Structure 1
Amino acid sequence: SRVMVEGVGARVVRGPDWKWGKQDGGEGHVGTVRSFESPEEVVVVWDNGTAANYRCSGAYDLRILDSAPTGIKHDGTMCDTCRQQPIIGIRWKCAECTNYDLCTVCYHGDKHHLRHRFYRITTPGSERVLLESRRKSKKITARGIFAGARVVRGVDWQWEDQDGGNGRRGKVTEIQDWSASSPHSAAYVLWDNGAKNLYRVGFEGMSDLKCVQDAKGGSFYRDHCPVLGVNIDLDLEIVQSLQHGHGGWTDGMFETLTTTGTVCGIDEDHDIVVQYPSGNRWTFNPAVLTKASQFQVGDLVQVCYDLERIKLLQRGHGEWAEAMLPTLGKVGRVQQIYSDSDLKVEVCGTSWTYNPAAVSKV
């Protein structure tokens, strides 16, 4: 029979039955499953430092963002994009293709076709759950202990005075695997005193670090996560073969394969310069990048006044509402550019979510 996996070390965010204000630090903020009091109750240590207990039966206060640190894996599978084998963590199987699967990183990282609907297969014992397409679903940003975050020592600190003392600060440079069997479970820190080392952020449910300034850790499809209990769209190899004399390849750039970058530079070397939320600048061949997007916060845009097309465009992105009718032809301001490249536009006082093709720059 099916049973619950008490996956200690799972990286979680708030769930559908959440009623605990901003204990987590807000929606999208990430925490670590420390332990299970019972099959009904779980204790989480949030990245902000607050440790608390939550429901994981009947009511569900938590969604699983990344189970990979628990080491749970689907032997006999492979992610057809990044070629992780076996898939560790949640398994995502394209329902509309023959024998195609993605890992969590690639799934939330918008690999494969966004209009193809996937099955979620959380555990080896799980029955597959058909989902809405990513393209019509809400995407939000993870926040907490990620590259660029400012941290202090956490509760499970057992590393003497490597940080120069309790309360002394450092910078997370990169999320790494504490071990081969537990990916995305560690954070490499460069302390303010020049010391540097790798620390547990999820491994065996341990929390060696605490945020004092959380960082963005990429975007995810919130409603596709199971309840607990500048862009690159080419193959790694095609990207590598294109970089032969236009920047080159170092593994430290892997982030780029699933992260939105801000084109802040061009250069004399017939190439491009991109910065990422990590804080990393990196150089590229023109063919490796695709725009996404052509708008900036503050840009004034006119809403499309062809109703047929805006209906098509908005429905295609799961954002149509008849209430939007009065906005046709109107000029508004780009308030925010979402991770799925849709635009939060302020128009007629109110704000709406638009397909970027449904507006034109004024």
Structure 2
Amino acid sequence: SRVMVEGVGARVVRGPDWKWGKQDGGEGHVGTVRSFESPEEVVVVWDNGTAANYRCSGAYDLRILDSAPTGIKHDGTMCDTCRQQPIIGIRWKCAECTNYDLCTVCYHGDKHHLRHRFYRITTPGSERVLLESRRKSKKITARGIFAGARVVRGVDWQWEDQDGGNGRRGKVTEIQDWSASSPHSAAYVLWDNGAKNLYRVGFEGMSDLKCVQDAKGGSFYRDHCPVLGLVNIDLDLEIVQSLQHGHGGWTDGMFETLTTTGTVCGIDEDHDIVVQYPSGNRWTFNPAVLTKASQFQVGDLVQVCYDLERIKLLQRGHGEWAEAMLPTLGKVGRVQQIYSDSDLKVEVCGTSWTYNPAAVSKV
């Protein structure tokens, strides 16, 4: 029979029955499952330092953002984008393709087709659950202990005064694997006093760090998470690797580039492109490997499309159509925010709406 996996170290966010205000630091803010008091109650240490108990039965206060730090895996599978094998964490199987799967990073990282509906397979024992397309679903940004975060020592600290002392600060440079069997479970810190090291952020449910300034950890499809209880690359890795022959090559530190937008910090002598990512990493590519787009900027004034057929198509295709939007057609408005799924929050007619970026034009 199916049973709950009491996965200590799972990275979680607030769930559908959440009623505890801003205890997590806000929606999309991340925490670590420290332990289970029972099969109904779980202890979470949020990245902001707050420890609290939550319901994981009948009522569900939490969603799983990443279970990979627990080591749970799906032997006999491979992620067809990044080639992780076995898939560690939640398994995401494309329902519309033959024998195609993604890991959680590639799934939330918008790899494969966003209009193809996936199955969520949370555990090896889970029945597969058909989801809505990512293209039509709400995407938010994770916040907490991620690259760029400003941190102090956390509750489970046992590393002497490596930080220079309790309350001394440092910056997370990179989320790493504490061990091969527990990915995404550690954070490398550069302490302000020049010291540096790797600390547990999820490994064995440990919280060595607490951010005083949380950072963005990339975006995810919130309602696709199971309840508990510049330039981008859109080309298949085998392509990338052989294209990289004589243009910087490939190393296993570059997988960030497959799902994370990087910025062109330069152009070298062999006409290859140097690219910097929020990790702090620089990487060099054959220009073929890279593709650029995302047009608009915050504060841009734009005109809403005035072809109703087209704007209906555009809004529906992106899961954001409402008849109430009719008075915005042809109106000029201001880009308030560029969402992670490329849609736009636009101030128009004294309200805000979410628009497909093709549904507006720079004025």
Give the alignment's TM-score, normalised by structure 2: 0.95
Residue aligned with 1:39, SS: coil
Residue aligned with 1:273, SS: strand
Q: Higher mean Cα deviation, 298-307 or 282-291?
A: 282-291
- Residue 197 of structure 1 and its aligned partner are, at CA, apart by 1.1
- Residue 329 of structure 1 and its aligned partner are, at CA, apart by 0.7
Question: Take 2:103 and 2:17, find their aligned partners in 1: how far apart are those partners?
Answer: 26
Question: Take 2:326 and 2:263, find their aligned partners in 1: how far apart are those partners?
Answer: 32
- Residue 267 of structure 1 and its aligned partner are, at CA, apart by 7.0
Gaps of 5+ in 2: none
Cα pair 1:148 1:279 within 8 Å, conserved: no
CA spacing shift, 1:332–1:269, aligned 2, 3 Å: farther
- 1:233-264 deviation digits (Å, cap 9, x = unpaired): 11223223334455554433321211133557
Q: Using the aligned pairs only, state the percent identity.
A: 100
Cα pair 1:303 1:358 within 8 Å, conserved: yes
CA spacing shift, 1:269–1:336, aligned 2, 3 Å: farther
CA spacing shift, 1:53–1:313, aligned 2, 3 Å: same
- Residue 290 of structure 1 and its aligned partner are, at CA, apart by 2.4
Cα pair 2:79 2:87 within 8 Å, conserved: yes
**1:306 corresponds to which residue?**
307
- 1:99-155 deviation digits (Å, cap 9, x = unpaired): 111110110011111100000000111111000000000001111111111111110
**2:11 corresponds to which residue?**
11
- 1:29-82 deviation digits (Å, cap 9, x = unpaired): 100000011111100000011111111111111000000001111111111111
Cα pair 2:345 2:354 within 8 Å, conserved: yes
- Residue 274 of structure 1 and its aligned partner are, at CA, apart by 4.5
**2:352 corresponds to which residue?**
351
CA spacing shift, 1:285–1:301, aligned 2, 3 Å: farther
Question: Take 2:232 and 2:99, find their aligned partners in 1: how far apart are those partners?
Answer: 26
Residue aligned with 1:238, SS: helix
- 1:151-177 deviation digits (Å, cap 9, x = unpaired): 111100111111111111111111111
CA spacing shift, 1:314–1:37, aligned 2, 3 Å: same
- Residue 325 of structure 1 and its aligned partner are, at CA, apart by 0.7
Cα pair 2:82 2:255 within 8 Å, conserved: no
- 1:204-230 deviation digits (Å, cap 9, x = unpaired): 100011101111111100000000002
Q: Higher mean Cα deviation, 299-308 or 276-285?
A: 276-285
Residue aligned with 2:241, SS: helix
Question: Take 1:263 and 1:323, find their aligned partners in 2: how far apart are those partners?
Answer: 40
Q: Higher mean Cα deviation, 165-174 or 136-145?
A: 165-174
Q: Higher mean Cα deviation, 69-78 or 272-281?
A: 272-281
CA spacing shift, 1:343–1:275, aligned 2, 3 Å: farther
Question: Take 1:248 and 1:13, find their aligned partners in 2: how far apart are those partners?
Answer: 37
**1:332 corresponds to which residue?**
333
Cα pair 1:74 1:86 within 8 Å, conserved: yes
Question: Take 1:248 and 1:333, find their aligned partners in 2: how far apart are those partners?
Answer: 42
CA spacing shift, 1:270–1:329, aligned 2, 3 Å: farther
Work out the number of aligned pairs and report it.
362
CA spacing shift, 1:183–1:282, aligned 2, 3 Å: same
Question: Take 2:254 and 2:83, find their aligned partners in 1: how far apart are those partners?
Answer: 17
Q: What is the root-mean-square deviation of aligned Cα atoms in Å?
A: 1.7
Question: Take 1:46 and 1:15, find their aligned partners in 2: how far apart are those partners?
Answer: 14
Question: Take 2:184 and 2:239, find their aligned partners in 1: how far apart are those partners?
Answer: 25
Q: Higher mean Cα deviation, 275-284 or 67-76?
A: 275-284
Cα pair 1:169 1:191 within 8 Å, conserved: yes
Give the alignment's TM-score, normalised by structure 1: 0.95
Question: Take 1:283 and 1:36, find their aligned partners in 2: how far apart are those partners?
Answer: 45
CA spacing shift, 1:107–1:60, aligned 2, 3 Å: same
Cα pair 1:216 1:277 within 8 Å, conserved: no
**2:47 corresponds to which residue?**
47
Residue aligned with 1:92, SS: strand
CA spacing shift, 1:278–1:197, aligned 2, 3 Å: same
CA spacing shift, 1:326–1:107, aligned 2, 3 Å: same
Cα pair 1:313 1:358 within 8 Å, conserved: yes
Question: Take 1:250 and 1:190, find their aligned partners in 2: how far apart are those partners?
Answer: 23
**1:287 corresponds to which residue?**
288
Question: Take 1:302 and 1:275, find their aligned partners in 2: how far apart are those partners?
Answer: 33
2:240 aligned with 1:239: yes
Question: Take 1:156 and 1:276, find their aligned partners in 2: how far apart are those partners?
Answer: 30
Question: Take 1:238 and 1:299, find their aligned partners in 2: how far apart are those partners?
Answer: 36
Cα pair 1:292 1:341 within 8 Å, conserved: no
